[PDB]
Amino acid sequence: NLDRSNDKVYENVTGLVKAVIEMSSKIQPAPPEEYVPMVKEVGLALRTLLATVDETIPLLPASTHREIEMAQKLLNSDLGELINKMKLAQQYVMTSLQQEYKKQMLTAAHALAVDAKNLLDVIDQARLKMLGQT
């Protein structure tokens, strides 16, 4: 379908999704000096992503703005929620609970990726609309 040669949204969503994947694969074996940076790395990707979307919004039809902004709302929400779990898992380092809190991080990050993927979907539908798809 759509040409992604210079689709910034699509790159930024890819790179945020890769970031979640990276963190996930790495998380279990990993102490806080390793797993905090990777969450930073997600957040940074996220912001790069929302900034791009802010620039794109005004190019896309009026009728789709609400829905997007909400998808953006959500992503922040998710990130927040991932940090919470991140902090919990740090409180309980080298204790019985370490691992079961890393589980709830993984759940949170998988949410983030899913929702970023959904954001991308919205954008596309917007472009397609604006590009005059049938």
């Binding site: 890819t14 999704v17 890769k18 979640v20 994947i21 996930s24 694969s25 993984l106 998988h110 990726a113 899913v114 993927k117």
Partner: peptide
Amino acid sequence: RMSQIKRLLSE
């Protein structure tokens, strides 16, 4: 889990 996002990763 892993396998789920890894597909949507490259569509």
